[PDB]
Amino acid sequence: MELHKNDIELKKYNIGVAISLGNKWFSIDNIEKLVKWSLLHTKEYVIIYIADSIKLSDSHAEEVAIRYGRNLFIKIKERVSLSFSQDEQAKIIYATWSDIADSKYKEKVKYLYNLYDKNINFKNYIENFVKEWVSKEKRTFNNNEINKFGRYILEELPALMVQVKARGVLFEAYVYPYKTRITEFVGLLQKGEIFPEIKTNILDNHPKIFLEVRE
């Protein structure tokens, strides 16, 4: 379980663990290993949050937090309190969607929402994103559901792109087991190589660092 870079063993960064809820790789055991890896390599804190989710709330991410995320976090906490010492447990921050989606963050989401409504090339590219995901599944989805899912990605996009605070604590880097179409998309966005208007408006030359960590 190692990094797939000298600043990492110089422990320059706090590390987030970006959990994909319902993704088969994110067993409790694989989460515990990412948390162990992060505690060893982090500057100080490890931030655990739900990074995506592929009506009790107008915000999809918030609905995921209240319906499933809490019970996920309860299981992670019990596992950690058996696997790690009290002083290591003190370094872990369980960041709900509310701890992340502060004022500044919601302005970034609203910029993306309005771009998704007023720019058809952006809507279409985000929608084509969803279609390739669910082309991999047996289940089928209409165009209205596809357009709904596209909005849901946008809610999580700033957290992948910009360095943000979880309950007062900046984390510059996050770990994820493999490159995805999303992490490739974010990489182009941060460079201004795709939809340059987004970098100009919502990003700021401290880019969120993606660390690929797996067995």
Author numbering: 1 to 4, 11 to 60, 70 to 230
Paper lines:
Cyclodipeptide synthases (CDPSs) use aminoacylated tRNA (aa-tRNA) substrates to form peptide bonds between two amino acids yielding a cyclic dipeptide product (CDP). 20_3 (GenBank: EFK64745.1) produces cyclo(His-Phe)8 whilst ParcuCDPS from Parcubacteria bacterium RAAC4_OD1_1 (GenBank: ETB63777.1) can synthesise both cyclo(His-Glu) and cyclo(His-Pro)9. ParcuCDPS belongs to the XYP sub-group of the CDPS family, characterised by the presence of 3 residues: X40 where X is a non-conserved residue, Y202, and P203 (numbering respective to AlbC).
By mutating the P1 residues, the activity of the variants was vastly reduced with E174A and E174H incapable of tolerating histidine as a substrate. 13 and 14). Therefore, the disruption of activity is caused exclusively by the change in these few residues which appear important for the enzyme to produce a CDP.
